[PDB]
């Protein structure tokens, strides 16, 4: 196939960068900080200006000391290593990465449309065609990632940005890992967790296809299939094998969702003999032109409004915080390959 060929060349490209990662391609003083776009446990994302090019980027800042306390060293090394090596239309481009005494930095392409999350909650829910446009782009992305033996593990509206053209950009590869065969780390976000993960069984790429189904459901229904006020209550709902669809769900949608939200891994779409084709040749995606989604020529159902470069009006406001850099190098050995 021409997809198979595209992937084969793509694996050669990825392997070259994987084996020989890039390093310290910038310094903090080359950027002007502007606004915190987002926050997390190990640090925040900031809109940043590249003073020499005048280009705006999103810069993810991780406090080394906090990464270590939360036992995320290996995870943080995976994220930079994978992200500098991959290249796909719906994956954030990592432009620069560097570290100082106190922090790790990854400068990435800035997607002014904001988080899908923000629009999804506001509007309430997406129409199937709307949801499908976004879903189709995730299907391709996973197809590509999984061909590289990468698992993604944190799919959710929060990690999907809308760019200027209204296409998705997958950020946050904080849990991405290159694994042939199986892995056991409990990570992800409670609502998106596959039962395998919560049952400490050992798991593989298939958890991404489960998460895709949570996503489609949440986009189309405006809420996730398993919610509750505390995580344990959510985990029970997930392991129970029991989903209710809203009544406005097309039956094709329900049907795709039932195969994706399947507790039996041997039976879950994405994990069978035909892998990703079971998803792409499903009735719900009949309307979808995959090559054209890939080539970015489909009209996006929703272009967010942006009144310039560096406009941040599609992001919530956060409390700012002065970037402290210690005079002592903080965890050199642990992060040497960053």
């Amino acid at each position: 196939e021409s997809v198979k060929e595209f992937l084969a060349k793509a694996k050669e490209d990825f392997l070259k960068k994987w084996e020989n990662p890039a390093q310290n391609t910038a310094h903090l003083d080359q950027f002007e900080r502007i606004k915190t776009l987002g926050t997390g446990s190990f640090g925040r994302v900031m809109l940043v200006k590249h003073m020499e090019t005048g280009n705006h980027y999103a810069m993810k800042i991780l406090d080394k000391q906090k990464v270590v306390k939360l036992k995320q060293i290996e995870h943080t090394l995976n994220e930079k290593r994978i992200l500098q090596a991959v290249n796909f239309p719906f994956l954030v481009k990592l432009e620069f990465s560097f570290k100082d005494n106190s922090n790790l930095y990854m400068v990435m392409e800035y997607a002014p449309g904001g988080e899908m999350f923000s629009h999804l909650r506001r509007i309430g829910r997406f129409s199937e065609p709307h949801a499908r446009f976004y879903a189709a782009q995730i299907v391709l992305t996973f197809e590509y990632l999984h061909s590289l033996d990468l698992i993604y593990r944190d799919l959710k509206p929060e990690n999907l940005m809308i760019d200027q053209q209204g296409y998705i950009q997958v950020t946050d590869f904080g849990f991405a890992k290159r694994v042939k065969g199986r892995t056991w780390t409990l990570c992800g976000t409670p609502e998106y967790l596959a039962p395998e993960i919560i049952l400490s069984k050992g798991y593989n790429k298939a958890v991404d296809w489960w998460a895709l189904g949570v996503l489609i459901y949440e986009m189309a229904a405006g809420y996730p299939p398993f919610f509750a006020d505390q995580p344990i209550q959510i985990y029970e709902k997930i392991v129970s094998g029991k989903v209710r669809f809203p009544s406005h769900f097309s039956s094709d949608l329900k049907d795709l969702l039932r195969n994706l939200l399947q507790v039996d891994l041997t039976k879950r779409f994405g994990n069978l003999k035909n892998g990703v084709n079971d998803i792409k040749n499903h009735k719900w995606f009949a309307t979808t032109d995959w090559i054209a989604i890939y080539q970015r020529k489909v009209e996006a159902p929703f272009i967010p409004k942006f009144k310039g470069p560096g406009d941040t009006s599609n992001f919530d406001d956060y409390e700012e915080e002065e970037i402290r850099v210690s005079i002592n190098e903080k965890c050199g050995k642990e992060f040497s390959e960053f």
Partner: peptide
């Protein structure tokens, strides 16, 4: 309604990952 129970729940905001 389910929407209304969701909206009244503690998890309509941005959801943090669990680490370990």
């Amino acid at each position: 309604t389910t929407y209304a129970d969701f909206i009244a729940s503690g998890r309509t905001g941005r959801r943090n990952a669990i680490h370990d």
